[PDB]
Amino acid sequence: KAVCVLKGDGPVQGIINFEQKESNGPVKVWGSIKGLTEGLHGFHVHEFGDNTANVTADKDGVADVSIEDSVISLSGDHCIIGRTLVVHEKADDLGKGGNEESTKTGNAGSRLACGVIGIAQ
Amino acid sequence: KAVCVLKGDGPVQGIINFEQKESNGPVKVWGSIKGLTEGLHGFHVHEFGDNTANVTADKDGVADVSIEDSVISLSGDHCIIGRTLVVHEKADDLGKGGNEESTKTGNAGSRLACGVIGIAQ
Amino acid sequence: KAVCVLKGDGPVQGIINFEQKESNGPVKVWGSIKGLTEGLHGFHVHEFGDNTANVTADKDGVADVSIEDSVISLSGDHCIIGRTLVVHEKADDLGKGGNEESTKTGNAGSRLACGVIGIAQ
């Protein structure tokens, strides 16, 4: 009743067991459910090390970030996602005037979104 | 009744067990549920080390950040996500005037969003 | 009852077992469910190391980022995703005026989206 048994010589390292025992039941909801994810797979082991017996992002770029265990819920309803502007104009001159309109805004720059966001703008 | 048994020689390291015992039942809600996530997978072991017997983000960039165990809920309803402006103009001169309009705003820059956000703007 | 048994010589390294025991039941919902994912596969082992017995993204580019264990739900309904602008104009001069209209906005640049986002704009 174990994961490893050791008789010979040598010191030891990562040996794991892990359980995650999950039992649903009956639910019985009347209507609708939306936004429902069901996933079961986790095993990522980039490098084991070893037994004995130059990274550069130049413009705007990121380096060495790693996120886990993060949930973002913003489902909502009847939503507008994006850029919007509702400038409203008319000219209608009468006399010795001269009607011109430009309604400039102004430049922007130097933003970046890294990681786990949702809406990034 | 164990995870490892050790008889030979050597000192030991990470050996783990972990349980996460979860039992639902009956729920019986009438209506709707939205924004519902169901995931069960965790195992990430970047590097084990070893047994014995130059990172640079230049412009705007980030370095060495790692987040876990974080939840953000802002679902809401009837929402507008994005940039908005409602300048409103008209010209209608009569005489010896001259009607011009520009309504500039002003530049912006030097913002960045890193990690786990939701709405980043 | 184990994963490895060791009698000869040598120190040890990663040996794992992991469980993920999941039991559904009856659900019985009346209506609709949308956005439903069911996946079960996890095993990624980039490099084991070894037993003994120059990366550059130049323009706008990223470097060495890795995300896991992240869920984003923003399903919603009746939504507009993209750029929008509702400038509204008319000219109708009468006299000695002269009706011109330009409604410029302003340039933008230097944004980038990296990782796991959802809506990136």
Author numbering:
A (entry chain B), B (entry chain A), C (entry chain C): 3 to 55, 86 to 153
Original paper wording:
We produced amyloid fibrils from recombinant, full-length apo human SOD1 (residues 1 to 153) overexpressed in Escherichia coli, by incubating the purified apoprotein in 20 mM tris-HCl buffer (pH 7.4) containing 5 mM TCEP and shaking at 37 °C for 40–48 h. The cryo-EM micrographs, two-dimensional (2D) class average images, and atomic force microscopy (AFM) images show that the SOD1 fibril is composed of a single protofilament with a left-handed helical twist. The SOD1 subunit within the protofilament stacks along the fibril axis with a helical rise of 4.82 Å and a twist of −1.187°. We unambiguously built a structure model of SOD1 fibril comprising the N-terminal segment (residues 3 to 55) and the C-terminal segment (residues 86 to 153) at 2.95 Å. The density of an intrinsic disordered segment comprising residues 56 to 85 is invisible due to high flexibility, which is reminiscent of the internal disordered segments observed in the structures of patient-derived amyloid fibrils from systemic AL amyloidosis. The SOD1 fibril core features a very compact fold containing thirteen β-strands (β1 to β13) and an in-register intramolecular β-strand architecture. Three pairs of intramolecular salt bridges formed by Lys36 and Asp109, His43 and Asp101, and His46 and Glu100 (with distances <4 Å) are identified to stabilize the intramolecular L-shaped interface between the N- and C-terminal parts of SOD1 fibril. Two pairs of amino acids (Val14 and Asn53; and Gln15 and Phe50) from the N-terminal segment and two pairs of amino acids (Gly130 and Asp125; and Arg143 and Gln153) from the C-terminal segment form four hydrogen bonds to stabilize the fibril core. In our SOD1 fibril model, Cys57, Cys111, and Cys146 are all in disulfide-reduced conformations with free thiol groups, and misfolded and aggregated SOD1 evolves from a pool of immature SOD1. Once apo SOD1 dimer converts into its fibrillar form, the SOD1 molecule undergoes a completely conformational rearrangement, with the antiparallel β-barrel of apo SOD1 converted to β1–β5, β7, β8, β11, and β13, the loop between β4’ and α1 converted to β6, α1 and the loop between α1 and β5’ converted to the internal disordered segment, the loop between β6’ and β7’ converted to β9 and β10, and α2 of apo SOD1 converted to β12 in the SOD1 fibril.
